[PDB]
Amino acid sequence: PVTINNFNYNDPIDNNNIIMMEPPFARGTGRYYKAFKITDRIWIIPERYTFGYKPEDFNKSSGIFNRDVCEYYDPDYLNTNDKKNIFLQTMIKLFNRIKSKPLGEKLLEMIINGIPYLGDRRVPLEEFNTNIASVTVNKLISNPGEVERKKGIFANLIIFGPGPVLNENETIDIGIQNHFASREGFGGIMQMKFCPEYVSVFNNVQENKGASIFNRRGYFSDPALILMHELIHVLHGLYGIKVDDLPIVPNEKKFFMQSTDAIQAEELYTFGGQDPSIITPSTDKSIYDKVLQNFRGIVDRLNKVLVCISDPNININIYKNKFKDKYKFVEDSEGKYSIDVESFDKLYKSLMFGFTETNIAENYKIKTRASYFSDSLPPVKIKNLLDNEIYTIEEGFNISDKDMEKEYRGQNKAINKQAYEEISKEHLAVYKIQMCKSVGICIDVDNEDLFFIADKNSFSDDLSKNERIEYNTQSNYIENDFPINELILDTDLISKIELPSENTESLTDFNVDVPVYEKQPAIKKIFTDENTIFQYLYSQTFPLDIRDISLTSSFDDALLFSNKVYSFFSMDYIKTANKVVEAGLFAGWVKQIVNDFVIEANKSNTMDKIADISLIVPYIGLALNVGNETAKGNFENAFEIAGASILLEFIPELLIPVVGAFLLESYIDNKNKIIKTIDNALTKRNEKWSDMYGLIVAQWLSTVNTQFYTIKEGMYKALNYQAQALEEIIKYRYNIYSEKEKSNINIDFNDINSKLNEGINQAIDNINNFINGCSVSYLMKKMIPLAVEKLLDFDNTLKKNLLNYIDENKLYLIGSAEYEKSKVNKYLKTIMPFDLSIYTNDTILIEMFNKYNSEILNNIILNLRYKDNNLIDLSGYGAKVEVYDGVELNDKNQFKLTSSANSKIRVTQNQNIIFNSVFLDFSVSFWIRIPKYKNDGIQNYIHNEYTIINCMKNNSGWKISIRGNRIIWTLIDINGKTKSVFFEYNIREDISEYINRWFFVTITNNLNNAKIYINGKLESNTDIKDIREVIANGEIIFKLDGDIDRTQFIWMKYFSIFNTELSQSNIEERYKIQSYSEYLKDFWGNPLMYNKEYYMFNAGNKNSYIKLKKDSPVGEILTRSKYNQNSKYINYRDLYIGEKFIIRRKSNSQSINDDIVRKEDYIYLDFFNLNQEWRVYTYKYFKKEEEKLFLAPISDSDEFYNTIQIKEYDEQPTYSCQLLFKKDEESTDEIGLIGIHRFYESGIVFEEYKDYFCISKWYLKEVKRKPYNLKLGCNWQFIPKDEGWTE
Ligand SMILES: [Ca+2]
Ligand SMILES: [Ca+2]
DSSP states (O other), X not given: OOOOOOOOTTSOOOSSSEEEEEOGGGTTOSOOEEEEEEETTEEEEOSOOOTTOOGXXXXXXXXESOTTSOEEBOTTTTOSHHHHHHHHHHHHHHHHHHHTSHHHHHHHHHHHHOOOOSOOTTSOTTEEOOOSTTTXXXXXXXXXXXXXXXXXXXXXXXXXXXXXXXXXXXXXXXXXXXXXXXXTTSOOOEEEEOOSSEEOEEOOSSSOSTTOXXXXXXXXXXXXXXXXXXXXXXXXXXXXXXXXXXXXXXXXXXXXBOOOOOBOHHHHHHHOTTGGXXXXXXXXXXXXXXXXXXXXXXXXXXXXXXEESSOTXXXXXXXXXXXXXXXTOEEOTTSOEEOOHHHHHHXXXXXXXXXXXXXXXXXXXXXXXXXXXXXXXXXXXXXXXTOTTTOXXXXXXXXXXXXXXXXXXXXXXXXXXXXXXXXXXXXXXXXXXXXXXXXOOEEEEEGGGSBOOBOGGGSOOGGXXXXXXXXXXXXXXXXXXXXXXXXXXXXXXXXXXXXXXXXXXXXXXXXXXXXXXXXXXXXXXXXXXXXXXXXHXXXXXXXXXXXXXXXXXXXXXXXXXXXXXXXXXXXXXXXXXXXXXXXXXXXXXXXXXXXXXXXXXGGGXXXXXXXXXXXXXXXXXXXXXXXXTTXXXXXXXXXXXXXXXXXXXXXXXXXOOOOOOEEEOOOSSOHXXXXXXXXXXXXXXXXXXXXXXXXXXXXXXXXXXXXXXXXXXXXXXXHXXXXXXXXXXXXXXXXTSXXXXXXXXXXXXXXXXXXXHHHHHHHHHHHXXXXXXXXXXXXXXXXXXXXXXXXXXXXXHHHHHHHHHHHHTGGGTGGGTTHHHHHHHHHTTSOOOOOGGGTOOOHHHHHHHHHHHHOGGGGEEEEEEEETTEXXXXXXXXXXXXXXXXXXXXXXXXXXXXXXXXXXXXXXXXXXXXXXXXXXXXXXEEEEEOOOOOGGGHHHHHHOEEEEXXXXXXXXXXXXXXXXXXXXXXXXXXXXXXXXXXXEOXXXXXXXXXXXXXXXXXXEEOSXXXXXXXXXXXXXXXXXXXXOOOOOOSOEEEXXXXXXXXXXXXXXXXEEEESSOOOHHHHHHHHHHHHOOSBOBOTXXXXXXXXXXXXXXXXXXXXXXXXXXXXXXXXXXXXXOBOXXXXXXXXXXXXXXXXXXXXEESSXXXXXXXXXXXXXXXXXXXXXXXXXXXXEEEEXXXXXXXXXXXXXXXXXXXXXXXXXXXXXXXXXXXXXXXXXXXXXXXXXXXXXXXXXXXXXXXXXSOEEEEEEEEEETHHHHHTTSSSOOTTOTTOEEEEOOOTXXXX
């Protein structure tokens, strides 16, 4: 167990547990410090840490020590005996809290027993030298007022009070002659500057601190966790594993880049969580090797140590036994020490990945910041840690009987205000970048608000080095993980070996290197005329001495006038916000503008499914203008085109090394070693893929995800500024009124703020999801593929290497010169899929990844869309698309392939996308419109098959072809084996749903079947289990290829490819999404237009058509004529028959040019009667259920309704529309829907039934039924002449 001693500052010096110490950095010259032994080998010195600091630097100034910290200064802290005693009792309480749990008690025991080796790099292997500043520290025995007698003592840790900056805790190791024992396996006396009362504050980006933008946000730290964080650094320094290696360094070449000190891997390990993932597997192994090498040196020393010259009283065996246990070396029957790989591996991982702030926080149920790279906030002062009503050894601030155990309420600033006090900003120093415009206006920006972007020098290039493949070579992986539970239960982890006595000979060699610290300017001037995130955020604020503001959508005016505040919300919102009303209308206006705010904020849930983008926050560009001028133009459109990339402030230059070659060692004649060598190269190859991926992840986390973090914080500040601005206006307007008026105004500010805050929280969640999606998108589409390229290239090179090796050694492989090549061929075939969880176990990162992978749209590897008069790939993988001159394109995303040699599209797909999942797994979807056969060319139409889309590489691939009325999907594997599945629509139908009409096609492929879906429905299926590998990323050629008629053509739209099999559910959804339009369609599926001649079709009476009756102002219904020739293969009913109707716009006299007919539009349904344009009317006064429509010349009569509203009652995709007559546009009085009705006629000679063009109220109720009745006689379609249909 661990015993924590008790004592008061005024207790007498006894030269044993209470001493007068001569600190290492004192160089043995004057001034001793009263020190207290809190536990064995651990001392507390309740005084400010002054080594290396100027006395005046303890006062707040115009300077700062660290550029990434809100520094608090207070030269009076610890300036009295009573203050020193409070510090002591507080440290005693914190150590008790630490050992209150096994994990922390274990940390303390490891630290107490991790005694520094007796010596350093300068000591002969055969000796123990205690006479060095990193091993022995002196205590003054003599009476006060005389350095008469001094005694030496061994120590592990000395904790001082804070240096100039109270909240800047730090652990310091001892360097002598430019070298650090604590970094070379020996370990050495560790020192710390610590302050328990002034703790850091942090706030979860995703999590909302009690969700209260008007109250204090964030959480304050548990000083016991802060202490344990530093103790972990102590632990590393004591075991001499605080090695230096390739550090993470921030890029500082641009004015928007955050400046910080270099960050060593050890610091990130200490924190834990996701931070270790920023240290590449390459650097992880480099550090492991350095520490292991350091331990080899110590184990050698233990085998050679013979004497201790400095202290004749040192018992050599006792120390050898102790050091053997410290480093977990093994000892043979004769006392020979050696390194045990298993024990070393366990010790190393326990020290680097077991004891981490994250792991400890989780075990002690203490809340802490999410990452070392989170923004720093001003600290707070804990009122009294010695008061058990506020802080306890067992629970810290989160005391259960105070109901503050849940959700870490005890550390919540908005909830546990009784626990802390805010700090005087007067004593705070913060490093700021002053961005001033050219002559100039200047804006101060806290260095913490800038973008942290790791420089490329931060990452290891070890992957570019060559590797020797021996027969015993093995691949190595260092898991940045460690079972915290096994650590807590690990028996032999803790020493049961006697701790040697601390008294030794006095130190006489005080040689030591003492750090010198200096403040630097707290403000750095930089010139820039850029208006990026910092300026946009700034334009949304107003001075404290101003209370009357107005909102504006003009960023420039907002900058210029102190009374103008920028807003990225709608024009209307801005207008209403600036509205002034009478007291009697104030409450109404408040409810209105507050509601408007919530509506505006909520636009953050905007969907864009037609562009294959599920979520998009439309106003991000206007709010921050971050990245590539995102405030200009339409953000949604700019995003559909370039994606996540447009939001980045800086595109990083990634390190993606050419993997070094493999040098397989030769073992002539020996066959066993030769085979082993082969396999080792293979397994090592995988280590290369994994390490490369780790390299990518590390860079993504420290150069890309960091920028997206800044953006998330920026949107939080932006939305808050907006709410604050609206609140300022509401207050100003309310205070203009008299007290008498105010008394009659029904307003509740707490409710106003509650509503504004809730809207912000909703917006924040959407924004966080959107941004995380963008970040992962960039990783998967803009980073991983670049790595895959290098890795595939490496594979090819190695393949050649190995095969050859098999050849030069075939004379030793006897009956395996074949078996080995096969194993190699298949191995370098299946590539390694990227799995983020392999490089990190952080919950938010993993769920971020899993979410992205669960969204079917991220499986799109090709998405040809129209943009700026051209077809381009918006999938995000950057396919090269060459559209030749003979391809017709329009803004409706339709493209036409003709019989011309230059009517072609060439697509070069990205070769670095995991398309080969070993087994076929992909889908292709697109819309198509195939022209009707030429009646005099039916034989060739049914006989000649022609390809339309071909994707082949090395004689393998897929293709889409057509043979008359059949569309065919064909696969060809590497062996030339072929299989096809097809859809054939009937060409003998009176009325076809497919011929010359737009329809949706979807082809899915999995390991077993190949199926074709048409308009969301499964139509055909083929068993393709016998199909071997199919190369599918070859060049895609869109072009009619075969024996086609010169008039042959094909229209296509929305061609896309998914690297997975779409489900019937996904397909049905895509069909509905791509079918949607505000406008109605015509018979062929194209947009319905005004001023366009159309024949009319009735879905409920397919073979019927309308004709003006000879001597009657009515439309008689006749039977369509039909295909007349003798071909046995075809049949249809004529479509270009009956009156030629034309649709006219009701309002706006913007002439009769043309335009799109939209649902709900009011129209006139006219038609041509020879040289005149007639109209369709409805006699107003009929009492029956239905009546014949009145067809006559254009004119206005009180007796006839002439206005029609075009409707769409079907909720599912259809080309039918309905026509409604309403009393008038405003009324809700429905006269009826246009249809066909049957009448009985009995004349003097003829007796029969005849159908007429009518209006009927009966349809009104029928169109409400579900599922929609497609057969209703009120369903019409408009047929314009089309080159794709001849009769
Ligand atoms: Ca790592
Ligand atoms: Ca302003």
